[PDB]
Amino acid sequence: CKNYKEKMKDTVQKLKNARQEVVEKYEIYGDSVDCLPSCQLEVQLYQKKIQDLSDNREKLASILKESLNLEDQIESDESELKKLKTEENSFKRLMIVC
């Protein structure tokens, strides 16, 4: 009677021990799953910053682009004025030699 009863006494402890091992591993994965939300959020913030960097680099290039175009306009307009002021002075002289 003690032969089988001990076997059943060992079987219960073998079962209770196995249960304890599965619960342990389950809790490790439970904790790991609980941390992935923070990992997901972090990658989101990095994607935002990279997208922000991309957009602002485009903005800078556009401003520098048009700023160089305005420099060409100032250069041209400075020629037109130079010509006009030369014509203005010539006619002031023509008025005298009338």
């Binding site: 009677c1 089988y4 009863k5 059943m8 006494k9 079987t11 219960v12 079962l15 209770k16 196995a18 249960r19 599965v22 619960v23 591993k25 389950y26 994965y29 439970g30 904790d31 790991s32 799953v33 941390c35 992935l36 923070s38 990992c39 997901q40 972090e42 990658v43 989101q44 913030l45 990095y46 994607q47 910053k49 990279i50 997208q51 922000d52 960097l53 991309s54 602002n56 680099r57 903005k59 800078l60 401003i63 520098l64 700023s67 305005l70 420099e71 100032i74 307009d77 400075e78 037109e80 004025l81 006009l84 002021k85 014509e87 203005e88 006619f91 002031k92 023509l94 008025m95 009338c98």
Partner: protein, 143 residues
Amino acid sequence: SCNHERNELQQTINKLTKDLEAEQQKLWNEELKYARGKEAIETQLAEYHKLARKLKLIPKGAENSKGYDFEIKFNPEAGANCLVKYRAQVYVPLKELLNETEEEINKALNKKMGLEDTLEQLNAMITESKRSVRTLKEEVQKC
């Protein structure tokens, strides 16, 4: 004793065996959730690295990287906050490129507006010079 005990021990075996099965199920379940949760992070990281390579923050020595290492490595099973620890490696140099950009944008916009006012000044001077030339013109021809 020979039956009451033995039989009671048996029912415990039956219960505990089903309890173990339930825990084996829960472990496998949580393992697959973690795997799906991972893959979702690797997918998002692939999108961040794809764009980083486009902006040439990556690979190492890329021309827009300023010598920083913007690559992020997610490895199976890492301590609480695997990726938050990268804040010093990747996040603070990134916000640096961002603020250097916005400052450089403000200096460029400062220069632009200066050139713009110079142009309106010239339009004013060119328009008044054209008036004078047209006026002196008529007066010369009036003689």
